[PDB]
Amino acid sequence: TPVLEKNNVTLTGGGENVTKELKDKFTSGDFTVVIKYNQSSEKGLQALFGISNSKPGQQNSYVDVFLRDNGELGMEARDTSSNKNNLVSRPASVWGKYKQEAVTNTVAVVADSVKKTYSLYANGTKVVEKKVDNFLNIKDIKGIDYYMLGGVKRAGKTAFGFNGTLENIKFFNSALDEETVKKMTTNAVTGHLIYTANDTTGSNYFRIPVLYTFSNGRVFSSIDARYGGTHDFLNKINIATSYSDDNGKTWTKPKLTLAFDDFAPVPLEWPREVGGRDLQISGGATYIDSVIVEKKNKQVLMFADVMPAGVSFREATRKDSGYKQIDGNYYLKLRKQGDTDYNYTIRENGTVYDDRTNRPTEFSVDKNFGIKQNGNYLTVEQYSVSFEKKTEYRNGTKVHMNIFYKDALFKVVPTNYIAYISSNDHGESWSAPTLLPPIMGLNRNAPYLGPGRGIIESSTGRILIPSYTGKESAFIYSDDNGASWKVKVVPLPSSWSAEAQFVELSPGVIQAYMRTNNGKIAYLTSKDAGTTWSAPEYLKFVSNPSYGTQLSIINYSQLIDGKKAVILSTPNSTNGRKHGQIWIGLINDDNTIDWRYHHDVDYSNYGYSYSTLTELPNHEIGLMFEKFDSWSRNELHMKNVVPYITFKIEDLKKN
Ligand SMILES: CC(=O)N[C@H]1[C@H]([C@H](O)[C@H](O)CO)OC(C(=O)O)=C[C@@H]1O
């Protein structure tokens, strides 16, 4: 039970003195403080409460919990005369605003002198726990004599003044246990996660959300389940999915849809300290960066990049497709252990052929890229990961030997591929993966997918899938309803990571909106359903760092102000992946777009990285996004940071 509980304390920087109420309550010196609050203004560093020695000379003798204007939650515990200064925090811990209202958050700190740890909670997640050698509790700090809500009294003056309402605050004179505080901090914000740390996927981390609405009214999601922290590479990554049959109100428990089992789908506590955060899982095959489209016959397609163990965007050979052409057919090539050349091909029925004799061997490759010998699977030992400093070790479980694995008898060229799977039941079940043929040419690697959706161009029925090479756009398309694939390769002005998404403006007229390396969003126009493309133009109202970020843009089915509309989601800040905005663009008779409305998702300094939009069956808009800066090295390996939210068009008109 609490030693003090206060309510509805509204403050504009001035604080409230609770010294009488708390002096003498903290007999051990340990504490837990649970704060339900909303901010009226996010600017500046703000303390939810402060326990201090307030006398002259003692300004570095206090304990607080604080909020920053970027959503970071932290705590300090400091003592002047011993020059001890503890700081524990996690970025991207709270929400600011949502549809014009201050968001209620619930945060907590626990100081446990027996464990010498400080822990912080926010909205049902333990965002950080840190053992510190210079531990300080209230009793360790010399001359504590002032206890304040909404500030810290330093040398007779209020510092870090809070602006908002403390809805409820509880002080306890002991360290409460993990499960209790998680539960006390659960609130509405907790319910915005579709994918959560250590859910059914077994992953602690997620990136790259995709939302898509099927013609039956199902709203479908996919995501990268990233097991070895949030690194793009090297990593062990599966694609997970989850769906809603009620306009997004409730979602299925995630399922694994594309996954390799050379490593198991198990939760790892990836180190966030500078000394460990660069660590990667290096020996494991992966699927990464998903694209969803629904065909006109209602079959659903999902594409993803395929990385063999040890391969990524960084390491993949650019000068080999991994295919060989033999008698006009293209066959995936293989190198056998102990050979220097690639002497083998996978041909009809998955039969592995020795290219030197042009005869079938006793080996074959199954529909999931697993290897058999005389009809029986070959196996290898699965890896697990251990920390103490990281080890990847053989764990004694047998999985099928696979051509994408580190320990295979036959291996593919160490480059990146694309695979696609199809579903005839709106994503309850999926075919085995098909690898894309060497559409870029035999002597070039596959392109890299632009995460989000593809489209069906309405006048031709052409299926378009966005991708990029690092130097060109690669618009993968089919003119036979997905039976065969070709590509339009478009050289770009510079080395853009050209993650793109399409809209259709009018029949036969499409635009590709994409990331660049120059700070702007580019759009290229085709008036022949993607066969030829204009020179790039640039949006004038978004200004981002040079590296860029993925965007989402969709067609919307309903008129807005009497006009056909598109809806765009992007960060908009030169300071980082921040300041999420949703823009409404109304299409004019002449196919120019009037970018008439924008909505700021949260405050400007709050994190906003990869995103995905979909129109719900009821004509509201669903948004999932990375609510953190996914470029920053300081925001790596964070749990429960990819929420789902919804807007009415009337919400999006405001800002
Ligand atoms: C396949 C892959 O690596 N995709 C990643 C992509 C890529 O590395 C970059 O575009 C190279 O320039 O970058 C990012 C990113 O947050 O910036 C995330 C993607 O998942």
Author numbering: 84 to 471, 474 to 740
Task: Reproduce passages from the article.
NanC is an unusual sialidase in that its primary reaction product is 2-deoxy-2,3-didehydro-N-acetylneuraminic acid (Neu5Ac2en, also known as DANA), a nonspecific hydrolytic sialidase inhibitor. NanC adopts the same overall topology as seen in NanA and NanB, with a CBM (residues 85–271), followed by a catalytic domain (residues 272–740).
Structures of NanC have been determined with Neu5Ac2en, 3F-β-Neu5Ac, and OC bound at the catalytic active site. Thus, many of the Neu5Ac2en to NanC interactions are also conserved with NanA and NanB. The ligand sits on top of the catalytic pair of Glu-584 and Tyr-695 and beneath the general acid base Asp-315. The net result of the movement of the 396 loop is that it partially constricts the active site. The movement appears to be stabilized by hydrophobic interactions between Phe-396 and the C9 carbon of Neu5Ac2en because no hydrogen bonds or other stabilizing interactions are formed between the residues of the 396 loop and Neu5Ac2en. When short Neu5Ac2en soaks were performed, the CBM binding site was empty, whereas bound Neu5Ac became apparent when the soaking time was increased.
